């Protein structure tokens, strides 16, 4: 039509503007830096107690307590140092696809096929965990939830939208619309002023929390994006997709910088996380073996192979001391 | 070596004990995934039993607890969440027999059945197939020919021949004949018999699973 042409004309105009800046690749710049060498990580703790598939995990900001979600309707809070279960929360709906731990540590959230994000109060005058709030606006399953503070949470959903919620009032403060496909992951920026969401349209969109608009769209991936993680700097992020390829995108350059792919790897990526430095990219896979990538040289530093099933979730501690990989084999492992 | 950490260990053991007890209780439950390509027959296979995403229906028949998950409300990419029901005891599939002259819908149901039956997650999960609208089907076949949907149908426009043909057409869509079974029932007005059919099919599934676990197959 008169204005449908302009949509595909602007996309070319953007493609040209982001090609003028591609003077040198990231591989060229980091060609003379030294390789990280061979990363050998041994399993330190094995967290057992989940009867069914583990679907999500999140580390606490104190780098000791982690929450994990399983298809059995239990939300277990673990003490990584001693392998002790601090709390076990029975969920009303067992079909939980995501879990988050508050930065303060006072609340945990979970969601899934019920389309509800439930906030659980961990520190109560009684000794039980109680449901603080149940957020219900989403019309599709919740894929990811991330806390901003005690009173603010951002949740992605399978109805192609993302939302910012006020826990006190239970209302959607802001709704992020623009993804054509189901949104599968979120990553909050270190400043918490921006976040990225990866959806099933093979695009990653940068969203600012305060004014609710999409600043940038990244479309390198050839298949559904299942995992997204921000770089520790906050100026880049890495995505994981069903095409068995992880790639790194730069916010400032507005384009893909490098691609992490191997010929032996043909299965999708379920989880993506970065190390404290940002030098190592940790990606979960469906081959039952996690892979460690050199984020600067696109080399595979090492493999973490200790699960008999899909590594559905992955997280690195805020101090960078350990990485936790949860899996469909019902076990969480701590690697160091 | 420990102090108020022994008390923490005791708390951890008490709660993992509760987790083990809860797991045993869940294992006794029979979980059924209810599927279909509309609300044509799903509403009728949930009406008799007494107990937004997933609507769970809990009922008890013959001292056995059943949990039936209706996931029709989830308008989303099925391949992103279908793996959650990998360990379901059986799949209940509902097909309306009157949807062969309506639009395409019978073809759409066959496409859904073929997709669900041959997933990598349901390689060994048996399917309880319900053919609804038995009463309506005879009126349609005495009003219109069955060749509207299946052009290769040689037979009279009678209930038995046409319905047996449709049952064959659905039971011929499964490529995993070596690992799973399709239990076909024509939904009847006597609903004591639909629940009886589900109970019998589930009992057969449990017996086969037990034989697999015991190493006798």
């Amino acid at each position, epitope marked *: 039509d008169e204005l449908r042409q302009e949509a595909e004309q602007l996309k070319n105009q953007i493609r040209d503007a982001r090609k003028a800046c591609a003077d040198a690749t990231l591989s060229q710049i980091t060609n003379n830096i030294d390789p990280v060498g061979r990363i050998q990580m041994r399993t330190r703790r094995t967290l057992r107690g989940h009867l069914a598939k583990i679907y999500a995990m999140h580390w606490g900001t104190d780098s*000791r*307590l982690l929450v994990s979600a399983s298809q059995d309707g239990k939300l277990i809070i673990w*003490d990584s140092y*001693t392998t*002790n279960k*601090v*709390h076990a929360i029975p969920l009303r709906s067992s079909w939980v696809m995501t879990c988050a731990y508050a930065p303060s*540590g006072n609340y945990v959230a979970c969601g899934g096929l019920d389309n509800i994000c439930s906030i659980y109060n961990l*520190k109560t*005058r*009684q*000794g*039980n965990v109680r449901v603080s709030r149940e957020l219900a606006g989403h019309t599709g399953y919740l894929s990811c939830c991330r806390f901003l503070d005690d009173n603010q949470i951002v949740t992605s959903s399978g109805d192609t939208t993302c939302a910012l919620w006020d826990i006190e009032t239970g209302q959607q403060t802001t709704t992020f619309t623009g993804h054509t496909g189901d949104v599968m992951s979120l990553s909050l920026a270190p400043d918490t002023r921006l976040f990225v969401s990866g959806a099933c349209d093979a695009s990653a969109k940068l969203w600012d929390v305060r004014e609710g608009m999409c600043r940038q769209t990244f479309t390198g991936h050839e298949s559904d994006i299942n995992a997204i993680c921000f770089f520790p700097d906050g100026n880049a992020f890495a995505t994981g997709s069903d095409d068995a390829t992880c790639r790194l995108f730069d916010l400032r350059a507005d384009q893909e910088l490098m691609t992490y792919s191997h010929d032996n790897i043909i299965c999708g990526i379920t989880s993506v996380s970065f190390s404290k430095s940002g030098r190592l990219l940790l990606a979960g896979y469906d081959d039952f073996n996690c892979n460690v990538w050199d984020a600067l040289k696109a080399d595979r530093a090492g493999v973490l192979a200790g699960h008999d099933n899909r590594v559905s979730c992955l997280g690195v501690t805020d101090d960078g001391m350990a990485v936790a990989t949860g899996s469909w084999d019902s076990f969480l492992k701590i690697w160091n | *070596l420990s*102090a*108020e*950490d*022994k*008390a*923490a260990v*005791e*708390r951890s053991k*008490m709660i993992d004990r509760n987790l083990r007890e809860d797991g045993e209780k869940a294992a006794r439950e029979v979980k059924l995934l209810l599927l279909g390509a509309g609300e044509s027959g799903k509403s009728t296979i949930v009406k008799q039993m007494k107990i937004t995403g997933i609507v769970e229906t809990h009922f008890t028949f013959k001292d056995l607890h059943f949990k039936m998950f209706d996931v029709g409300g989830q308008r989303s990419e099925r391949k992103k969440w279908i793996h959650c029901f990998e360990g379901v005891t059986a799949i209940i599939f509902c097909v309306a027999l009157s949807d062969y002259d309506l639009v395409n819908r019978m073809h759409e149901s066959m496409k859904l059945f073929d997709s669900i039956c041959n997933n990598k997650w349901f390689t060994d999960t048996s399917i309880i197939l319900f053919l609804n609208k038995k009463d309506l089907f005879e009126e349609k076949i005495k009003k219109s020919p069955l060749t509207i949907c299946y052009p290769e149908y040689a037979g009279s426009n009678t209930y038995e021949e046409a319905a047996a043909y449709i049952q064959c057409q659905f039971e011929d869509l499964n490529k995993r004949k070596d690992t799973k079974e399709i239990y076909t029932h024509f939904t009847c007005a006597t609903e004591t018999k639909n629940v009886q059919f589900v109970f019998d099919a589930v009992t057969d599934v449990i017996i086969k699973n037990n034989l697999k676990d015991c190493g006798l197959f």
Partner: single-chain antibody, 232 residues
Framework: VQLVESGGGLVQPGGSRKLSCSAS????????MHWVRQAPEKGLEWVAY????????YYADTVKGRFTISRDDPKNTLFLQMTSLRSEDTAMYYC??????????????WGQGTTLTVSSSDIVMTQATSSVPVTPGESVSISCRSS???????????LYWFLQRPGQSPQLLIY???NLASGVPERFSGSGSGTAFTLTISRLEAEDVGVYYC?????????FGAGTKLEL
């Protein structure tokens, strides 16, 4: 949260008595419970402890073999059966709830107490001062000392601080040396070296006078200090 104690009265020496603590307003089954007596015009003394689930029971050497503590989770009641009572058992008995997990505040709630009147290796916690005259608005430091170091290998120094306001049950102020309890103003702060510890009140109020007790939770039996009195 409410703990109500019953069963007290005048008992002849050599007799028996049964004390009941009725828990209300919290998940009683998940909390470990303690009995703490306070003798007339004397300080706090730990008596017994029962874990959540009744798995672990501890008693003081004074009452070991005479007193038995039991729990009723369906009825939310804690019991102390006291046999062969002697006149040293005349005291105020307190029902205390304690939950143990990483980051828990043990000993956070205390009951109002029941009065029992019987007619006629352990770590020593030392509080040097018994009475401090104070005026509102100044900084007060309350010192406590321990026979053995309270710092454990895991990094936790188990020294709890309690305030007993006049005619009231003791209240938890600081847990594990530095952690401030829920609901307590930030005027209070605890710092210690592993064997010598101090409690600082930055600004006084009329609601801060009372006796301040230091307790160790490194090992059983739990021991208290003699108590430091703050007066106007």
């Amino acid at each position: 949260v409410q703990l109500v104690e019953s069963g007290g009265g005048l008992v002849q020496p050599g007799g028996s008595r049964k004390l009941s603590c009725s828990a209300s307003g919290f998940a009683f089954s998940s909390f470990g419970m303690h009995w703490v007596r306070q003798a007339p015009e004397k300080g706090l003394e730990w008596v017994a402890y029962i874990s959540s689930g009744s798995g672990t029971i501890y008693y003081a050497d004074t009452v070991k073999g005479r007193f038995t503590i039991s729990r009723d989770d369906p009825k939310n009641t804690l019991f102390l059966q006291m046999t062969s009572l002697r006149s040293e058992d005349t005291a105020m008995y307190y029902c205390v709830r304690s939950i143990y997990y990483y980051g828990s505040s043990p000993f956070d709630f205390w009951g109002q107490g029941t009065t029992l009147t019987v007619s006629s290796s352990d770590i020593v916690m030392t509080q040097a001062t018994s009475s401090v005259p104070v005026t509102p608005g100044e900084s007060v430091s309350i010192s406590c000392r321990s026979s053995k170091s309270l710092l454990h290998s895991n990094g936790n120094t188990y020294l709890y601080w309690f305030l007993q306001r006049p005619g009231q049950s003791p209240q938890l102020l600081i847990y594990r040396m530095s952690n401030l309890a829920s609901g307590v103003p930030e005027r209070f702060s605890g710092s210690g070296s592993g064997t010598a510890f101090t409690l600082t009140i930055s600004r006084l109020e009329a609601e801060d006078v009372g006796v301040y007790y230091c307790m160790q939770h490194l090992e059983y039996p739990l021991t208290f200090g003699a108590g430091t009195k703050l007066e106007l």
